Amino acid sequence: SQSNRELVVDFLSYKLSQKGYSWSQFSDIPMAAVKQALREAGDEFELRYRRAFSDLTSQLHITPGTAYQSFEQVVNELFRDGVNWGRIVAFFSFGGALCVESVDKEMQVLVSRIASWMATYLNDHLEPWIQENGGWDTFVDLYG
What total number of domains does the chain contain? Predict the structure, then answer.
């Protein structure tokens, strides 16, 4: 969806900025509270877990040739026991970590692609649980 892609792009842009990278590779109940709550959850999450998904990124070893199906299979790893608010946060951090790794690999073109994959994955596999458990309003309630 449009809002999903917007949420994803906001979180990724935020992580790249915060870590010294560019976010230009994208373009060329409210939404603000959700985005802010997500930026916060990610920071909180990354402060206690610093291994930045070494294993997962390894399994994927993303390149310009990687296909969505490969991405989807690696991420499912996070949801072997089903969806959680916490696992959703890890999902976003993972995407952020993937983007950073891509820039460090001189594969900045994958950033926008990664963003699309996350929006697709979020819409397909995550939103179902999210909507069943209070929607993003419940998310703000817990992470606001």
Answer: 1
Experimental method: X-ray
Tell me the resolution in Å: 2.2
Which residue range is the domain that position 38 belongs to? 1-144
HEC states along the chain? CHHHHHHHHHHHHHHHHHCCCCCCCCCCCCCHHHHHHHHHHHHHHHHHCCCCCHHHHHHHCCCCCCCHHHHHHHHHHHHCCCCCHHHHHHHHHHHHHHHHHHHHCCCCCHHHHHHHHHHHHHHHHHHHHHHHCCHHHHHHHHHC
Question: Which CATH number fits the domain that encloses residue 72?
Answer: 1.10.437.10
